[PDB]
Design a protein around this ligand. Structure first.
Ligand code: ATP
Ligand code: ATP
Ligand code: ATP
Ligand code: ATP
Ligand code: CIR
Ligand code: CIR
Ligand code: CIR
Ligand code: CIR
Ligand code: CIR
Ligand code: CIR
Ligand code: CIR
Ligand code: CIR
Lengths: 439, 439, 439, 439
C-alpha cells in the first residue's frame, strides 16, 4: 500500500525538513531506528527565518544521509500573484479575508520538494504535519500528484512514533538523550506558520474565542492595535500592467520576489491585511486563526479597485463567484485539479489581462485606509459619461411593464398561498417567516 | 399608455415630495400649468433632516392640493435588518461594501407612498428622479407593483419641464418669479441621498476618480481620515437572538428603530463602514459614490463573525453567493420579485434563525477594528475539539488515491494538449497563458 | 468508538434486513457467533417484492430476537414529490436524468428504521451494504442523525465476517450448513435495488461500457427498445395543484402512494424515464448504472413544462442551479443537512407553490413523447401578448450603446493581448485556443 | 444619433437581405422613397433553401445598388461546435433542449454581413426583424460591435414604413403596384427560421398552447410522431478527437460543414432533437417555439456521454452551470461579450480538450435512443476499479462524526425555531411549509 504504518527500516526516506523540533527529532529517530532519512528544506522567504543554509546542516548533524535546500520563492510568489489575479480567497468575515498563504506554500512545497527527491531516487516521502490537520492532506495530494510511484511515511501516522515522542517534552528529552542540546525552552501562546506571502497564527491560546489579536506578536507588521505604536499616514501607489504588479511607489523591480518583499514592507508598516477567522477545515470541525499578509492585502485592494473601473457587472460577478470557489479548492490542497485550473486560467486570461493601471491609497492603521486616485487606460468608467434622451428612457421604462405585471401577479399568488401576509397593494409586501418581527 | 409625456392638465397628480429644490419647483410648476398636485413625503429618519413636519407645509405653500407625511422608519429598518441577515450587498472593493441603503430606501418609499395615495384616490404618480439614473426606474417598478391602475408622470421625462426648469438656476429663478424666496445659495461638491440606514454621496466633484473621501463632510460619522480628529478606541458588544439584533453594549431597546439609531451612533463615532465604490448602474455605464452606513456595518461584522462559528461551509458559501445575487436584485429595484423573495426567505429561515450570540469588538478609526470575543450557544466551533485516530486518518487519506490518480492523468493530458508547459512530474505545473510571466 | 470492528458478542444488534442472501446469512452468523440480532425491514413498495410479511418471518427463522416490518411508503413518496418539486436530480447525460431513487430510499430507510429500533432499546446498528459503495455511508449518516448514542456494526466492515462469508457461494454454503435451504441458484448479469420511486441496475456485466440496456429485464416498465414489443401511443394528462400532483388522466386519489403507483403504471407501459449513466460516487471512482423511474419521469416532465410557462427567467435558473446542487447533496446522503433543507424549502415555497395546472402528453416508446397541451391559471405566458411601440424599442435599443461600446473596447484589448486573433471589426471574433480549428 | 427614425433619403443603406417578402418589399420601398439600398445575403446552409444565388438577383431586380452573397457556413458550424463543447444551451423542458440555433446564426450573420459592408463603404445598417422580438436586438448589438461608426435604419422602427406596408397583404400589393409579381399565396400555420444548425418554428398557430408539434412539417427530419412513417432502428457511432467531432459512422470529412450536414442526415432520419419550449425573451414576455436540430442533438448526446466518463464531478458541474449561463448570454445576443468569452474559452480549453473517444447509439423514433458503447483513452471510469480496505472505510466513516453531530445539532435548532416539526430523533425530519401535505 501507499501509506506505511510503521518505519520502513533500512529504506531511504525523504522528509520535508523545516528544522523545527518535530522534524529534527523525527529525522534523528528515523535514523536511530534504522531508516535512511534524506532531508529536503524549502526556502519560502520565511519572514523570521534566521539562516536557511543552517537547516540542512542540522539535518546532517542529526543523521540525514543527504540534505538539500530548495529555493521555492519564485514559484511561491508566482502562485501568490495568480491568487491575487483570481481573487482566490474564501475565508472572509465582514470583508476581512484570509489570503490562503499556507495553502499556497504547500502547493509549491509539496510538489517542488518531491520533484527534487526524484534526483536522489528516494521513493518514500513524508513530513511532520499532525494527523489532525489540513496540511497532512495537502502534502499528501501534492506529493502523489508529482510522483506516482511514491510510498508514504509520516511519523504522525506511525503509532510507534507518537507513543515514544508524542509530546514536545518527549522530543526535547529525546534530542538530549541522543547527544544534542536543542533550544525550545520557549513555548509561545500559539504556533506559527509563515512564508513570504503571509504568516498564520493558531492553536494553544488562540483556540479560545476570548483570546484576540492582542496576544499576537506580528512578524510581518506592527501592532496597529497598540495606540502607543507610532504609525504615520503614508501615501502609496500600486501599478499593474496586464494583471501583473510592476511598481510600488514608482519603483520597479528586477523580479517578482523583490516586488513582493516591498509590498510586504509597505503594508507591514501599517499592519494591513491582518484578520481573525473562524473557518471550516478540509476535514470535520473548525479551527481559529489570526493571519498576516500585508503585501497580498495591498496588491488585492489595488487590483480590485482597478477591476471595478474596468470590467462589466457580469464579469466582476464571475470574478467573485469563481474566485471564492477557487479559494476553497486552493485551501483543500486542490490548486492543480482540473476544476481549479479551469477557473484560474479563465480569470487570468479574461479578467487579469485587462487590469492595467495605478491606484493611490493612503494607509493609516490596520485595515483603515482611503483610496486617493484610480487611473487606467482601460477604464470603462468616465466622468459625466447626452448619450440617450428622456424619450429613450420612457421607452426603456415602458418595456418593463409586462415583467412588473407578472411579478405583481406572483405577489398576489404568494399572498394567496400564505407566503406573504399582504401583497404590494397595501404597501410593503410582508414575507411570512420567523424573522419578520421586531425586538 | 402608462407614462404621460406631458403634464396632464386638470388631473390629480401625486408626487414623492422631498422638499428639495427639484420637487419644490416641480410641484409649483405643475400647479402653475394646470395640474392638481398632491405631495407625499416619507419620514426615512434622514440624519441631517431638520424637521419633517415642515416639508408638507412647504408643499402646501407651493400649491399642493393636499400634503401628507408618511412614517417609513419601521419598515425601512425591518428591510435593512433583512438585508443584514441575508448579506444582500454586492458592490465591494477589497472587502469594503456598499450596504445598498438607497435601494432599501426606494423599496419602502416607492411602495408605501403609492399605497398612501390610494386613500386620496390619485392615480397619476411621479417623483423628481433624473431620467439618467437608477432611482427613476426603482420608483417606477415599486410604484407599478403597488398600484396596477397607476399612470406615470415625471417632470424629468417631460421635455416641457426640462426646457423650462432644466437647470438649478432656472429652478431658483422660477421660485423667485412665483413669489417664493428659496434657499439654495449653497451648491456642494457632490449631491447627497440619505436615510436612517446610510448616506450616499456622488456626482459633481465625486465624478472624478482623483477626488477622494477627503472632500466629503460625513453626516453619520466623523472624519476618521483627519488625524486631528480625536477618536478614542471603544469596546462594543453586539448581541443577536435568532438573527435579530437585540442589544448593543448591554442595552436593549423598545423597537428596532431605536436599536438602529444606537448602532449608528456607535459606528458613527469611528467612521465605521465608509467606502468608495465604482459600480455598474441598472442601465448602461458606471457611477462613483462614497458611502456611509455605520450601524449597518457594525451589525454586519458581528452577524458574519457569528455566522462563521455557527454554520457549515456549504451553508456559509450559499450565504455569500445568494447574498451577492440578492444584493444585485435589491440594487436593481427588484427586492420583491420572486427570485429575490426566494433567496431572502431561504436565508432568513435557515441561516439567520440560528444566529444567536454576542460579539465584542474594539473600534478604532474607520474600518480598523479588532474582534475581542465571540460567544454563542449555537457555535459548532469548540476549542481543542481523540475524535479520530491516526489509523482513521490513514484510511481517509488512502481513499483519495484514485482521485489523485485521475487528476494526475488530467495534468498529463493538459500537458500533451499544450495547456500546461510541464505536468506535476517536474515540480509546479505551469499553466500556459499570458499571466505566467514575471515582471 | 462508534464503529465496532468486530462482533459485539452478547449484545443486541439491530440490522436493516432486506431478506436477501447478504443479510439473511449475516443475521444467522451474528446469532451463531453470540450476538443478539434484531431485524428491521422497510416496506418501500418494491416493484418485484413478493410478500413483505414473509421477510420478518425468515429473519425470525434465522435467529432474530425480534423482527419488525416498518411501512415507509408514505414518507418515501412524500420525499420523492419534494425531489420533483425541487428538480433535485444531478446525474444527467444528454437530458436523460437519474431520479436519485436509491438516495431517496436510504434517507427514509436510514432514519425510520433507526427510529423504530429506539422502541426496542437496541443501540448497535448496521446493514449489509458493501464497504466499497455509497450506501454504507448514506446509512451511516442517516442513522447517526437519528440516534446520537448509536454504535455501529456492519458485517462488511468486520474482517471476521468477510473472511468467512465473503463470497455469495460461502453465504449459500453457510445457510446450508446451518440447516437452511436458501434459493439463490440464479445470479443475474447485474444487481438490482428498487423501491416505489424507481429501480437501479448495476455491477457485474453492467460494469462494462459495451453492455447496454439490452441485457436488462426492466421491472417497472417494458422493453421499449425491442421493436417486437407492442406499445401503442397513449394520451395522458397530469395535473398539479400548488406543486402537488393530484390527478392522472382525470383520476384523483385517496393518497399520494396510490397516485405514484398510477404514475408508475402509465410511464411503465412505455418505458419512460429509463437512462444509462456513468456517475461519480460519494467516494473516489465512478460507477455505471441503468435506471428506471417511470412515474417520477412522468411527473418531472409535466412539472417542468408548467414551470416554464409560470415563472420568470431568474426563478427558472435558480430552480435548475439549486435543484442540481440539491440533487448532489441528496445523492451524498445529505438530504437533511442545513444546506439541503435551505435549498429544498426555498424551492418548495417560492417555486412549487405556484405550479398549478395540467399538461397533456402523448407517450410513445421510451423517452419519445410529445407535449399536446399546457394549461394553467398561473401562466404568465399569453398568446399574442400593442404593449409597447417601435419608438419605445428605439429607446430601449439606444440605451445599450454604452455597453456595446465597452464590449467593443474589450474585444480590442483581448485582440491586443493575444486572446482573440481578430476583434469584431473583421467579422467573427476568433478566440485563441486549441479548439479553434476544423477537422 | 445611431438609430434613424425615418428613411435617410439619398443615403446608402445596407440591409440584411433574406429574400423573403419583408426585405424584398422594404428594399423596393427604400429605393422607391429615395434611399440607395445595398443588399447583403448570408449563406447559412438553410435546409429548404432553393438557390442562394438567386437571392442577390432579386435584390438587384427590386432596386439594390449592389447585392452580395456572403458564405457564412464555415463560421456558423465552428460556433455551433463551440456551443456543443460548452453545453451552451439554457432553454430546457424535462431534459429536451433548444440548441440556440437562431442565436448562433445571428452572431455570425450580424458580424460578417456588417464586415462585408465595410468594403462597400456603406454606413447605415438594418434588417427586417420585427420591433417586438429578440432578433432586432441581436442584430443591433452584433452590428455595432463590428462597426462603431454605423448608423441604424430598420423599416420596423420607422413609423412611415409600418403604416404603409405594415401587413403582409400591403407588402404583396406593394410589390404588385411596383410591377413585380411575388409568390406568397401561401401563409403557413407558423413562421420558420432556419440554418444548417437547426430550424425554429413559432408564431401564428404555435402561439396557442393547445397546438402541438403535430401541425409542424419538419424540414430537417421526419414526422416521428406519425406512426405511419417508417423509421427503422439505426446504429450510429460518433467520434471526437480533442473535443472536435471527426467521424460519423466511421466516415471522416474534408471539413466541418460536411460533418455537420451528415450529423443532420443521421439525426434527421429519426427526428432526433425536436422539442417544444416556452421560453423567456430578451425583453419582457414569453414566447413559444418548436425546434429542430438533429445534428446538434446527435453531437450533444455523444459529447456528454464521453464527458461523464472522462471528467470529475466538480468539472462536470462547472460544465453544466457555466454552459447554462453561456447559453443565456448566447440567446441574448452576447456571445462575444467578455463574460461569455471567459466561460466559452475556459470550457473549450479544460473540458473539451480531453473529450476524445467514440460513442455508439441506437436511434429509434424522436428522442428515443439507447447508448450501446462508450470508448475513450481518457476515461477515468474503469470496470471493477483492492484499492482500499474495510479498515480504510472505517477510518473515512469515522471522520464524518463531527459533521454529523453538527448537522444533528442544527436539526434540533430548526425544530426549536419551528422550521422542522420534528427533528431526526423520531424518524424523517419534517420541513414546515405548505408542500408538506398529501393529496
Ligand atoms: N520550509 C520548509 N521546508 C520543508 N518542509 C517544511 C517547511 N516548512 C514546513 N515544512 C513541513 O511542513 C510540516 C508542517 O509545518 P509546521 O510548521 O506546522 O511544522 P511542525 O509540525 O510544527 O514541525 P516543526 O516543529 O519541525 O516545524 C513540517 O512538519 C514540515 O515537514
Ligand atoms: N423623504 C422622501 N419622501 C418622498 N420622496 C422622496 C424622499 N426623498 C427622496 N424622494 C424622491 O426621490 C427623488 C430622488 O431623490 P433625490 O434626493 O436624488 O432628489 P432630487 O432629484 O435631488 O430632488 P430634490 O432636489 O427635490 O431633493 C426626489 O426627487 C423625490 O421625488
Ligand atoms: N427494504 C429494506 N428494509 C431494510 N433494509 C433494507 C431494505 N432494502 C435494503 N436494505 C438494506 O440496504 C443494504 C443494501 O441494499 P442492497 O439491496 O444493495 O443489499 P445487499 O448488500 O445486496 O444485501 P441482500 O443480499 O441482503 O439484499 C442491505 O444489505 C440492507 O441492509
Ligand atoms: N440568410 C440571410 N441573410 C441575410 N439576412 C438574413 C438572412 N436570414 C435572415 N436575415 C435577416 O433577419 C431578419 C429576420 O429573419 P426572419 O426570417 O424572421 O425574417 P422576416 O422578418 O420574416 O423577413 P423576410 O420575410 O424578408 O424573411 C430578416 O428580416 C433579414 O433581415
Ligand atoms: N501540523 C500542521 O501543519 N498542521 C496541519 C494544518 C492544519 C491547520 N493547522 C488547521 O487545523 O487549521
Ligand atoms: N499551523 C498554523 O499555524 N497555520 C497553518 C494553517 C493555517 C490555516 N488554517 C490554513 O490551514 O491555511
Ligand atoms: N436623481 C436621482 O435620484 N438619481 C437616480 C439614482 C441613480 C444614482 N444617482 C446613480 O446614477 O448611481
Ligand atoms: N444620488 C445619490 O447621491 N445617491 C443615490 C444612489 C447611490 C447609489 N449609487 C445607488 O444607486 O444606490
Ligand atoms: N451494497 C450496496 O448497497 N452498495 C452501496 C451503494 C453504492 C452503489 N452500488 C455504487 O457504487 O454506485
Ligand atoms: N446497487 C444498485 O444496484 N443500486 C444502488 C445505487 C444506485 C445509484 N448508483 C446510487 O448510488 O444511487
Ligand atoms: N422577425 C424576427 O426575426 N423576430 C425576432 C426574433 C424573436 C423571436 N421570434 C421571439 O420572439 O422569440
Ligand atoms: N422567428 C422564428 O421562427 N424563430 C427565431 C427565434 C427562435 C427562438 N425563440 C430564438 O429567439 O432563438
Amino acid at each position: 500500500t501507499t501509506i506505511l504504518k510503521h518505519l520502513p527500516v533500512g529504506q531511504r526516506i525523504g522528509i520535508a525538513f523545516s528544522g523545527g523540533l518535530d522534524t529534527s527529532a523525527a529525522l534523528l529517530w528515523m535514523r536511530q531506528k534504522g531508516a535512511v532519512p534524506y532531508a529536503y528544506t524549502a526556502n519560502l522567504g520565511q519572514p523570521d527565518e534566521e539562516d536557511y543554509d543552517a537547516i540542512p546542516r542540522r539535518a546532517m548533524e542529526y543523521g540525514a544521509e543527504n540534505a538539500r535546500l530548495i529555493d521555492c520563492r519564485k514559484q511561491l510568489v508566482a502562485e501568490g500573484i495568480a491568487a491575487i489575479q483570481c481573487g482566490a480567497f474564501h475565508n472572509t468575515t465582514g470583508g476581512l479575508t484570509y489570503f490562503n498563504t499556507t495553502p499556497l506554500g504547500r502547493a509549491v512545497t509539496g510538489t517542488m520538494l518531491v520533484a527534487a527527491m526524484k534526483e536522489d531516487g528516494v521513493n518514500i516521502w513524508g513530513d511532520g504535519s499532525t494527523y489532525k490537520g489540513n496540511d497532512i492532506e495537502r502534502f499528501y495530494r501534492y506529493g502523489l500528484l508529482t510522483n506516482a510511484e511514491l510510498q508514504i511515511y509520516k511519523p504522525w501516522l506511525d503509532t510507534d512514533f507518537i507513543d515514544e515522542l508524542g509530546g514536545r517534552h518527549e522530543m526535547s528529552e529525546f534530542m538530549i538523550a541522543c547527544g544534542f542540546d536543542y533550544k525550545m525552552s520557549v513555548e509561545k501562546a500559539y504556533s506559527t506558520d509563515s512564508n513570504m506571502l503571509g504568516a498564520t497564527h493558531e492553536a494553544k491560546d488562540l483556540e479560545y474565542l476570548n483570546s484576540s489579536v492582542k496576544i499576537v506578536n506580528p512578524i510581518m507588521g506592527v501592532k496597529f492595535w497598540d495606540e502607543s505604536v507610532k504609525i504615520p499616514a503614508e501615501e502609496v501607489t500600486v501599478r499593474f500592467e496586464q494583471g501583473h504588479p510592476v511598481a510600488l511607489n514608482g519603483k520597479t523591480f528586477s523580479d517578482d520576489v523583490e516586488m513582493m518583499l516591498e509590498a510586504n514592507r509597505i503594508g507591514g508598516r501599517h499592519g494591513l491585511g491582518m484578520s481573525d477567522q473562524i473557518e471550516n477545515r478540509i476535514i470535520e470541525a473548525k479551527s481559529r486563526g489570526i493571519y498576516e499578509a500585508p503585501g497580498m492585502a495591498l496588491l488585492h485592494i489595488a487590483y480590485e479597485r482597478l477591476l471595478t473601473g474596468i470590467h462589466n457587472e457580469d464579469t466582476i460577478e464571475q470574478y467573485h463567484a469563481h474566485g471564492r470557489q477557487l479559494g476553497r479548492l486552493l485551501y483543500q490542497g486542490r490548486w492543480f485539479d482540473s476544476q481549479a485550473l479551469m477557473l484560474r486560467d479563465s480569470l487570468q486570461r479574461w479578467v487579469a489581462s485587462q487590469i492595467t493601471g495605478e491606484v493611490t491609497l493612503e494607509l493609516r492603521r490596520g485595515n483603515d485606509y482611503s483610496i486617493l486616485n484610480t487611473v487606467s487606460e482601460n477604464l470603462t468608467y468616465k466622468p459625466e459619461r447626452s448619450v440617450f434622451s428622456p424619450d429613450d428612457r420612457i421607452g426603456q421604462l415602458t418595456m418593463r411593464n409586462l415583467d412588473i405585471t407578472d411579478t405583481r401577479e406572483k405577489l398576489f399568488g404568494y399572498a394567496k398561498t400564505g407566503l406573504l401576509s399582504s401583497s404590494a397593494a397595501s404597501g410593503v409586501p410582508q414575507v411570512e417567516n420567523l424573522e419578520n418581527k421586531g425586538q
